[PDB]
């Protein structure tokens, strides 16, 4: 599909500006410009998975909804319910988990503070 | 369990 | 046989008298397993049925956050709502949600649905390839649109058929003795002069579970709707159901009629005749 | 908008033997929008102690709920299911019958 | 503005969804996980400056207006017109610095390639 | 003085007849110094100044890159407003965008631009706080809303307030010899009878640079906005400009009429009479 | 949406019999940009004629200069020709050293 | 020098 494809192209240009505007360019800032050449291998790589995924007519690739389903899964255990799925790998998720709970009072804070007219 | 957030309509 | 997970939540504005209610109830089949009340005291979602009380106190958290993320979305949902359709605030209105899946005897996924009304009348609602989506009208299709550049419609295919099965087994499993219970109906039949030459059998089916049951009158092998009379099934309050059908027959005929009662928790369907 | 009116069934939980406890049941269904008012009646005088079920709806998105309370039924006691709702002209009064 | 702060609630969370799909969960992806607790941190340190230069502006916050016509400027030059920034290094760390640079031109002309292949295989 | 950068892109839809045409061309003030043309062999940014050409080859590598991103997005561009407009695929259609900077006597910024029609209407338009949108019409409100979503205004307005500047002032620097230069007009008047009461004096300015330039006739020193013709400014072919204004007078009253000239590069302005 | 073309004839450097100049055709002012511009000499068309890059001005209707090397002479003549959408007919303008 | 892209409209 024609429309598809406009916007995801329109996305990949959208979140380059997004990636683009806080990155000071210098020797300071090496270790940020390394991690925005990752982003943008990934914005680049979730493109192609909604390529796969919406498209009629497309070439061979890997279908991502199993993955999806599976990340799913496994995210609302990890963050939420803590059904269990070697220390290093336990001390990420507790540290990733406390992101996605700030990560939600970040967003929620917003609604509050000028969201909301009452 | 709960679907992990809903959007805004 | 088969299940279903389902959750319902209603979200009422209260214009003048303060914060939007916000409900959330929680159902395996026909057992409701939690709630969530924005005006009650606790603000965390509750256990309903006793094989949820078993899960730690993480879970509890879990679900207490996800279902506040419901609550307050839903709360931007009625005023952007109020203001697609041009209403004064002044009016109360009402946002319903159902979301779920079903699984078959063997447990694996059949269908998943989501569901959104708003003043009682569906508004959007996901189709069942999980993909596309039924926009109501032309306030809807701003919705879709926006639904459909955030990918609502593959979040909930993801969870409908990972999150939303595992925790529908697991829950089958814990509340194995009760949910995987088959209460066969109680029946019995009451009679009635109703008229100078008509009376009444009304058949009777009590403390039965599932609800889901089946109670048809025939007269010499035939079934009929006239002068049938089926009440909605009930909740007794003690985790069964109540259902009764009536039947006017002439008086001096009550032998030609009997009652049917099908149901999973019956070897055989019932025939009952008055006696 | 077309407001739907409540359907109400008077009921006990188990079936009815004077002095044995019980439950007497008030399910009001098929209603929307949700505000309503229920109250089981004790010789027409309202029973303190009710509780209800948490609000839920059905598949045409009409709401559903159980009120309830116990009791201890009598010869000589008669009970009732006081309902009000924005489609009544004025409460809706259903008596309980022991069938 | 509450649309603003809609649509910025609303956006955090669409992209928070594009992390997650893609978030394997295993040992030895450690580093993935790593990874996306930096790109959580981005997103919400993104819509801060979104609000900060939209929605009035709740003036306590700094304006990123500068910093957005500044590191435009340099990225016109590092990708496009190859004009020298300067007092970018020291001898030090000259190498470091000219290394990523040039990773990161080859990065973006790749991400150019990649999006407009696809307006031509599939939008045209 | 002040100064600008422009650049103007030109894309026709060519039905039937392959690929549209895209045509891009930039200019310092009256200067121009860049072309695109996708009709052409070379497929390349081209110079079309020579203080442009010691730019090295890196450079015109990049804006190569950028005006070819630029062409397959104006492509685009005009599959999307025909379905905006629902248009058939059987007529021609034009797209126009310019945008570009204006600095001041001390090179600061002083405003941007950027602007777009369709088939010679405004369609949409960058206002002058650089924070809003002009949009004509219904169509033009689609592109507004997925502009404003993808932040094009602030996209723009980095690009204004910095490349735009930092790059007018570069080449102000590489091409001071011909874009700093003024060359004052070089004047005369000519005589044409055209009945026996009736003279026509034309004033003509030559060879002068920038193009901006006042000409006015005065009959015994009153201006004469009301019975002089006046052409448009056009360019000799050279990088100057020529113009000029005519009055018809009373055959021999020709004295009591003087043609004012005005131009940056006059200390005083000129004043002529004939002969 | 459409606009008419105005023209302009005239040389690059003032007129004189024998010396090497530019015969200039400025079409202006015209919309959509498909335009038949020619320049002729004596009637007849000339021929490698070349033409500016194609520009707009801020009302978005077009602008193109045409010419070509010429000297003139006493006895030649020269127009331009403009042909368009908007035109009912070609437009002929006689080169004139006003 | 050019914009770095344009945004489809």
């Given at each position: 599909d024609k429309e598809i494809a406009k916007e995801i192209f329109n996305m990949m240009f959208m979140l380059l500006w997004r990636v683009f505007r806080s990155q000071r360019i210098d020797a300071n800032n090496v270790e940020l410009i390394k991690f925005n050449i990752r982003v943008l291998d990934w914005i680049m790589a979730e493109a192609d998975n909604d390529l796969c995924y919406?498209?009629?007519?497309?070439?061979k690739c890997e279908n991502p909804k199993e993955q999806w389903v599976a990340n799913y899964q496994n995210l609302n255990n990890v963050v939420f319910t803590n059904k269990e799925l070697k220390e290093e790998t336990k001390e990420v998720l507790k540290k990733f988990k406390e992101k996605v709970n700030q990560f939600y009072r970040h967003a929620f804070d917003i609604i509050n503070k000028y969201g909301l007219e009452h | 369990s709960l679907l992990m957030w809903i959007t805004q309509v | 046989g088969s299940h279903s997970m389902r959750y319902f939540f209603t979200s009422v504005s209260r214009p003048g008298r303060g914060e939007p209610r916000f409900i959330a109830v929680g159902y395996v089949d026909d057992t409701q397993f939690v709630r969530f009340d924005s005006?009650?005291?606790?603000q965390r979602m509750e256990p309903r049925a006793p094989w949820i009380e078993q899960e730690g106190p993480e879970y509890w958290d879990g679900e207490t956050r996800k279902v506040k993320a419901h609550s307050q979305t839903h709360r931007v949902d009625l005023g952007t709502l109020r203001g697609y359709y041009n209403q004064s605030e002044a009016g109360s209105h009402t946002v319903q949600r159902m979301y779920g899946c079903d699984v078959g005897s063997d447990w694996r996924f059949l269908r998943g649905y989501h569901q959104y009304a708003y003043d009682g009348k569906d508004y959007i609602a996901l189709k069942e390839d999980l993909r596309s989506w039924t926009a109501a009208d032309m306030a809807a299709q701003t919705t879709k649109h926006k639904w459909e550049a955030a990918h609502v419609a593959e979040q909930l295919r993801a969870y409908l058929e990972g999150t939303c099965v595992e925790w529908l087994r697991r829950y089958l499993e814990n509340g194995k003795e009760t949910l995987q219970r088959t209460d066969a109906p109680k029946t019995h039949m009451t009679h009635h002069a109703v008229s100078d030459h008509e009376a009444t059998l009304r058949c009777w089916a009590l403390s039965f579970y599932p609800a889901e049951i089946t109670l048809t009158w025939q007269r010499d092998g035939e079934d009929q709707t006239q002068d049938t009379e089926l009440v909605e099934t009930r909740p007794a309050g003690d985790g069964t159901f109540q259902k009764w059908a009536a039947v006017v027959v002439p008086s001096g005929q009550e032998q030609r009629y009997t009652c049917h009662v099908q149901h999973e928790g019956l070897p055989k369907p019932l025939t009952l005749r008055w006696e | 908008m077309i407001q739907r009116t409540p359907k109400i069934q008077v009921y006990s939980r188990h079936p009815a033997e004077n002095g044995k406890s019980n439950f007497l049941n008030c399910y009001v269904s098929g209603?929307?929008?949700?505000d309503i008012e229920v109250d089981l009646l004790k010789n027409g005088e309202r029973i303190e102690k009710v509780e209800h079920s948490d609000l839920s709806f059905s598949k045409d998105w009409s709401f559903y709920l159980l009120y309830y309370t116990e009791f201890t039924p009598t010869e000589k006691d008669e009970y009732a299911c006081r309902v009000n709702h924005v489609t009544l002209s004025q409460p809706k009064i259903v008596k309980w019958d022991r069938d």
């Open positions: 919406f498209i009629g007519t497309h070439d | - | 005006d009650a005291a606790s | 209603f929307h929008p949700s």
